Structure formats: structure tokens, C-alpha cells
């Protein structure tokens, strides 16, 4: 059953949104004490982990760190710790800064373990789609079309354009050119392609993904081992090879 | 791009022909061809004062 694949991918979108709105207020709350940090390191969890590590600017002058902020932003944060337009905070609000920082660190821990759960349920529900287009891409395909069987009984052209409905139907209701990527643009194979042949292998990837997807939804002696998805992926990979080998130049 | 100029191409005509939208407004005489770089933006009236410009 996959009634919770839709739930997990909606939680994933919602939760990345709440991570961003927590990181912004952590950055501008701790920015009173040390303002250059949010502009010299931009990662939310690296920011939270570093203020959990040091706390204060003189504390940064006496401490060091290498498990966070790799090997080249250290001199920048030390120079900005030595000279800064930032004030000095107290302990009673450094405690809430630290509580927010451990809060969003645990938030990202929950994010990556929810992604582990999504990968597990996806490769136990429709594993050939995972072997072809990937876990979260196939997950939002299934979550877009509702049911796995309702996605399986759709043609491969629909699976190609599946995300781009407003562009599709405006380009049909006036006589314009339809999109070619849809939700399948973020597959790794289409990432490997470059030019007009990412439209070409969006087409061949949607064809093989329709094959693997309706195998997964309609099989009964299925083995959850990735065999049909893997042979389909080998077909798409050597096709991508043979149309990246050609070149429109003349040699 | 022309793809966005073909979406905001009508209210740029309204701003070009401002002078004949209200019979009491009577702007100062400029020409105002379409500028090369522009941006279409929406006014944020804030959450401080109500009911007047709202």
C-alpha cells in the first residue's frame, strides 16, 4: 500500500519550508551578536552547529573547529570574530539561541530520517521506478497522480509531461508548443543530458518509466529486487551514450 | 523577454495613455516610451494603518 507515500512527500515539502523559516530567525537573532557569520557561512545546520559549538566571539577566539565549516572559512570567521559590528549577548538569551540551534539541528535529523523512510517505502512499493528515476522523483510522480495503479494506466507521454500541466494546457488552448520536461526533469539521467537531447531522453525515460511503473503496479510475482528497472536503466543509459556521442559540428 | 512583454504589454499601454483614463487627472506632458529594463511590482500596504488605502 502507498497511502503514506503521498503523506511523506507532503511532509517533506512542508518540513523543508519550516526549516527555512526557522533558520532565518536563528540567523537574524544571533546576528545581533555576530552578524558576519550568516553571510560568510550560509548553511542552516552548519550555522546552528557552529553556534552550538562556540556561542560567543571571544569563545571563538579560544576555540577551533574542523568537523563543521571545512578548512577555509575558519580564517574568515576568526577575522570577523576579531573585528565586528556586533554586540555582546547575555547568557539568558544565549540559552534560547542554543535551544533554537539544537532545535533546527534535530529538525534536519528528522528530515534525513524521513527521507530514509521515503526511500524504504518507495523501494518496497515501486522499486523499478526507484531504480530508473529515483526515490523522491518517483514518489512525487505517484503522489501527483494519486494511486500507483492510476499512474500505471497512463501513457508514457503523460508520464513525461506529468508535472507541467499549466504550461501544457495553455500551450494547447492556444496553439503553441507544449513543454517537454514536466516533473521528470529532475531525474539524474536528464541531468546528465545536455541540449535538446534532454527533451529526447525525457521522452525515452518516460517510456521506460511507464514500462517499469506498470510492471511494478501490475505484477504479482514481483520480487522487489530492481531487475526490470535495472535493465530499463541500462537501455536508457546506453541510449544517452549514443546521443551524447554524436556532435552537430563537422570534424 | 518578449514572452513577459507579451503579458504586461497591455498595462504598459495603460501607463503610456494615462492621460485619458480619468477626465479629471491631467498629467504633465511626457512621452514615456517603454523602458528597456523594467519590473512589475505590487504595493505592500503594511499591517499598521487600516481602511484608508486598504
Amino acid at each position: 500500500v502507498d497511502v503514506m507515500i503521498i503523506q511523506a512527500i507532503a511532509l517533506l515539502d512542508d518540513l523543508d519550508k519550516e526549516l527555512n523559516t526557522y533558520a532565518m530567525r536563528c540567523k537574524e537573532w544571533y546576528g545581533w551578536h555576530f552578524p558576519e557569520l550568516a553571510k560568510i557561512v550560509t548553511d542552516s545546520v552548519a550555522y546552528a552547529r557552529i553556534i552550538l559549538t562556540m556561542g560567543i566571539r571571544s569563545k571563538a577566539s579560544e576555540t577551533d573547529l574542523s568537523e563543521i565549516l571545512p578548512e577555509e572559512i575558519e580564517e574568515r570567521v576568526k577575522t570577523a570574530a576579531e573585528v565586528s559590528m556586533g554586540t555582546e549577548i547575555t547568557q539568558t538569551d544565549l540559552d534560547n539561541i542554543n535551544a533554537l540551534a539544537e532545535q533546527i539541528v534535530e529538525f534536519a535529523a528528522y528530515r534525513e530520517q524521513l527521507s530514509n523512510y521515503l526511500s524504504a517505502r518507495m523501494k518496497a512499493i515501486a522499486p523499478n521506478l526507484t531504480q530508473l528515476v529515483g526515490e523522491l522523483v518517483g514518489a512525487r510522480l505517484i503522489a501527483h497522480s494519486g494511486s500507483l495503479i492510476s499512474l500505471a494506466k497512463s501513457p508514457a507521454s503523460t508520464i513525461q509531461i506529468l508535472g507541467a500541466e499549466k504550461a501544457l494546457f495553455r500551450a494547447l488552448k492556444t496553439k503553441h508548443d507544449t513543454p517537454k520536461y514536466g516533473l521528470l526533469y529532475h531525474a539524474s539521467l536528464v541531468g546528465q543530458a545536455t541540449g535538446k537531447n534532454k527533451g529526447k531522453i525525457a521522452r525515452v525515460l518516460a517510456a521506460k518509466a511507464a514500462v517499469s511503473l506498470r510492471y511494478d503496479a501490475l505484477a504479482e510475482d514481483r520480487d522487489d529486487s530492481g531487475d526490470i528497472g535495472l535493465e530499463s536503466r541500462a537501455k536508457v543509459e546506453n541510449r544517452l551514450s549514443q546521443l551524447e556521442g554524436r556532435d552537430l559540428r563537422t570534424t | 523577454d518578449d514572452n513577459m512583454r507579451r503579458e504586461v504589454q497591455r498595462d504598459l499601454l495603460l501607463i503610456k495613455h494615462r492621460a485619458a483614463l480619468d477626465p479629471k487627472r491631467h498629467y504633465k506632458k511626457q512621452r514615456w516610451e517603454v523602458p528597456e529594463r523594467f519590473a512589475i511590482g505590487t504595493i505592500i500596504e503594511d499591517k499598521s494603518e487600516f481602511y484608508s488605502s486598504r
Partner: protein
Amino acid sequence: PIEYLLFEEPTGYAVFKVKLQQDDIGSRLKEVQEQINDFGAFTKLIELVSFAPFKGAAEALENANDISEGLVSESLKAILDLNLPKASSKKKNITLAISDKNLGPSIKEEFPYVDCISNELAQDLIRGVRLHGEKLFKGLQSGDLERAQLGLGHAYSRAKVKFSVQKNDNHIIQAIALLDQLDKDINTFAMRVKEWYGWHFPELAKLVPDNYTFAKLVLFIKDKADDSLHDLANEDSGIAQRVIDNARISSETDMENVCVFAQRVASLADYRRQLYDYLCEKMHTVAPNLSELIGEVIGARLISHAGSLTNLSKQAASTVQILKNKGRISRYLANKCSMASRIDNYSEEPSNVFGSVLKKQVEQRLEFY
């Protein structure tokens, strides 16, 4: 003769030695006035002999205040005693060019063999070395001079104004603006927890409707159990054990996952009400009169919607949005609350007594009706 030059700057002190005098009589002419703009000719006038850098931003702020109010500090004494020759005090003093005519007396009070010049010749020598800056110093300072200037300007200004970060209302702005965010986050996350546990039995969200209490009790119940003694935090607990006996809904990996989700909801639920206690405390130390009058969370939302304690203070009393007789107690509480916020903002370290008096006044007014 303008023999030496003293340039103060945020990184430290610099003593320059004047090589060639500029013209005194032709000092207003065009070529003399733009030779201090050309660097290739200014380096014919000025040579750096010493630069004592500061020990940090603390000594930088100390020397910025001493230079500001016209006193010779100890680092000044050190560098001048190192660099200036032991001239006489009665015949041909050594001539130091400063930019501050009331720092000069403090220099002669410490070194009587030094006469100090700050007239237009020393002024444009000084502004020549200000105009060129980092090029004269030949690479010998740590720290970019404009970055130290930003730090020293902010430090000097906060010192001069006595900027306290305890009575800093941006903390309570961001605290309540984050608390509303996590109100809706704990709400939607525990709604999804109740949804995912709704097919384990759909009566726990009927008996126990509060989000935190539901989440903490379902973090340890994962089964039937019986042994209903430590589930009272017992009429609702007895009804819940009866419903677990009469279980009427339907894993392991999914159930472990929704346990992690409810643990996330519990972590959000006790980071909230840590934040709430923090902002009640911060509101008592930042706005005690407002919090005595209408309460800590209400005063927090009041100064948030106003934007600052200063904006709520300087707002008119008839334009305060607080949250018949019922219609005009709002106006009475509004203008008393505006009064209390003015007291609380512009007093420097406030008491609670005027919030108490205004609370007494508004309770007298509501009890009169």
C-alpha cells in the same frame, strides 16, 4: 618646520617623519593643493617611521575615547617617547604635527620638549595621509583599516549612547514572531501525528484532544498495554485502556516512523513554553509596565505589531490596536497602555509601580461600570 607627524587611526598609532616641507606661502596654490592628491609626489613629503598597532578592539575603544576627548593615552605615551628625539624644552622644541588643537596641550603636558602644530599645513599633511592610507604603511598592519573602522565606529557609538542589549526589544520581536511560527508548526505536525495514529485506534484524539498530551502518551503506547497506572499524565486513562481492550483499527517500520514524528512534536512542544517563559522574563525586564497592565504575551504582540517599543511609545494613544461600555474600555485601556509604554520605553531602567497604578486605574474604571 613640521618635523614629525602623528596620525591616529583605528588600527593603532603612526608616527611619520616629514622629509620635505610643503610651501607655506604658496600653500593655497593649485599645484600645492593637488600634490597631496597625487601619490607620486606625496611620498616625497611623508615617510613612515613607526606604527604601534593596538592590542584589540578594547584598547581601540579606549584610545578612541581618549583621542575623542583630547587626552594622551598610555600607548600614545609609549610611541611618542620611542620616536621623538629628546629635544630641549627652552630652545628649539621638536615639532609634531597633529590634527587636534586640544590634544596638543595634553601632549605638551607629558613631553615639554614638543611643540604641536595643527594649522592648515598640518591639516593638509594629515588629510594627505588620510587620503592615501594603506599605501603609506607599506603593508605593516594586520586587519583592513575600513573593517576596523566599521567595528570602532559601532563600538564608539554604542558606548556614547549606552546601548544595552538587555533592554533590547528586538529579542522580544523575534521571540513572539518565532512563537507564532511554532504555534502553527506544532499544530500541523501533531495534526499529522493524529492522522497517522487514527488508523491504530481513532479514539485517542477523542478522549485526549490536546496535542502535547496525545503525542507524549502515544510515544510510549504502541500496542495493547492493562497496567494503566503511569498513563494518567485516571478516568480518561481508564477509558483509554477500555478502548485499547476494544481496539477498533489496524506496522513496524511505519509505526517506528510515526514514533519519531511524535518525538519531534514533543521536542517542539517543550521548546515552546521554554520560549514562552523566556519572553515573559524578557518582557518583564524590557517592558515591566506594559506586562503589569495587560500581560506579557499581549504586550509582546502589541510591541510586535507596533514594530518596536519605540514605535509603540511614539504612537498616538488614539491609534493603538489593543486586542458601549465594552467598546470604550478598549479606548481607556488603549490610552493607559500607550502611557505605560511611553514610561517603559523612555525610562532607562524601569520599575513596575506605574504599570501597577495604571492597572489599578483601569480596574477601577471597569469596576465602575
